[PDB]
Design a protein around this ligand. Structure first.
Ligand SMILES: COc1cccc(N2C[C@H]3C(=O)N(C)C(=N)N[C@@]3(c3cc(-c4cccc(C#N)c4)cs3)C2)n1
Length: 390
């Protein structure tokens, strides 16, 4: 590992998101910030809020600059509103540089800040095209690259614990690494396989085949990317298009049919529990997503285990049982490879070469019989047809 200063700089879990420490203003104001490859704004709480124990105080920063413009961001299941400006921003456990970046000072929000969550803002790492209010507001990473010599690439190792982490534990535990400007070889095993970034807005990719325990879901591959497929550290679950979700759940139920689970479990609403240590991992299937490779007619696959798609949750009776929620759910906005997918791999966002790399994560949860995997190559024809166009 050549980036020791950035290794283990993340904290959190899939259900609450993973965050990194950042500072804003002069003198520096420290804040915990959610790492989000699913958005492109750097936005931080800038006013008192019941669920925040600290926030950005613009009046105390000598380097604060008011852009005299507001921003309103309503998203499904939540929203935030704020005031735009710029200031000096740094990442203590990151590159040793300070950059002037845009900051959306959140003055009002709805279902944005979660009680128990330890972050006070979000770092949108995707492209300008989806920045709010529009693409003229340069994203943080673009500013970083333009103002310093930091390579146009970052990589993420999100580490799920495999069991519940209480309030004390989640604050005292290492949740992963965000390597800014490079690839740390200590974070993965095996080889890195790259899939092209289809278009630079979200980190869009193309899935060309899906298997449940080796059995081909056998759907027109266009269905897998309808209306798009993205890699999003800011989404907890692996989300699949309605029709794909229906087919996948049917296959996962069939593979695990030796035990019957309630509809609420499959809907991701209710937890299921087993006596301590007896979770029947082996009855659940592995899931393989084949992604377009960099070479013509070549693909590779990433395989996850139920240890990735069954999210550990504390039992309501805080018993000694091991409980989980099914972390695969349906979407009407395309496939979203969220945290439970990313927890199995070291993911390289190679913006410079317009590609995303995947390798087995050194911190993925597994058992003595199965492990997550990244394998290739496979001959796959007409992969462009798998991409959707409106
Ligand atoms: C910040 O600026 C902007 C701009 C436009 C949109 C935008 N966002 C759209 C939201 C969204 O719907 N997704 C999917 C996402 N990728 N990021 C957002 C949030 C995620 C969480 C959150 C909470 C808990 C856990 C996890 C996890 N894992 C994530 C809260 S808001 C921020 N942000």
């Amino acid at each position: 590992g050549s980036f020791v200063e950035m290794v283990d700089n993340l904290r959190g879990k899939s259900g609450q998101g993973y965050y990194v420490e950042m500072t804003v203003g002069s003198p520096p104001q420290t804040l915990n910030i959610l790492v989000d490859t699913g958005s492109s704004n750097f936005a931080v709480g800038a006013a008192p809020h019941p669920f925040l124990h600290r926030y950005y105080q613009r009046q105390l920063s000598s380097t604060y600059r008011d852009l005299r413009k507001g921003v309103y961001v309503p998203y499904t299941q939540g929203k935030w509103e704020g005031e735009l400006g710029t200031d000096l921003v740094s990442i203590p456990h990151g590159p040793n540089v300070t950059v002037r970046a845009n900051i959306a000072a959140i003055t009002e929000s709805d279902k944005f800040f979660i009680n128990g969550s330890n972050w006070e803002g979000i770092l949108g790492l995707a492209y300008a095209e989806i920045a709010r209010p529009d693409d003229s507001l340069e994203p943080f990473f673009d500013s970083l690259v333009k103002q310093t010599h930091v390579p146009n690439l970052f990589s993420l190792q999100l580490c799920g614990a495999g069991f519940p982490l209480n309030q004390s534990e989640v604050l005292a535990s290492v949740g992963g690494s965000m390597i800014i400007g490079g690839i740390d070889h200590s974070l993965y095993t095996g080889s890195l396989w790259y899939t092209p970034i289809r278009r630079e807005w979200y980190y869009e990719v193309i899935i060309v085949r899906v298997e449940i325990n080796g059995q081909d879901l056998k759907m027109d591959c266009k269905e897998y990317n309808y209306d798009k497929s993205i890699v999003d550290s800011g989404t907890t679950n692996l989300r699949l298009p309605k029709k794909v979700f229906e087919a996948a759940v049917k296959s996962i139920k069939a593979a695990s049919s030796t035990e019957k689970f309630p509809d609420g479990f499959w809907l991701g609403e209710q937890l299921v529990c087993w006596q301590a240590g007896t979770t029947p991992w082996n009855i659940f299937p592995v899931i393989s997503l084949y992604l377009m490779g960099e070479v013509t007619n070549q693909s590779f696959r990433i395989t996850i285990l139920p240890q990735q798609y069954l999210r550990p949750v504390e039992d309501v009776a805080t018993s000694q049982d091991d409980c989980y929620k099914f972390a695969i759910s349906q979407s009407s906005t395309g496939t979203v490879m969220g945290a439970v997918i990313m927890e199995g791999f070291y993911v390289v966002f190679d913006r410079a070469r317009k590609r995303i790399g995947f390798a087995v994560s050194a911190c993925h949860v597994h058992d003595e019989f199965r492990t997550a995997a990244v394998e290739g190559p496979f001959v796959t024809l007409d992969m462009e047809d798998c991409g959707y166009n409106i």
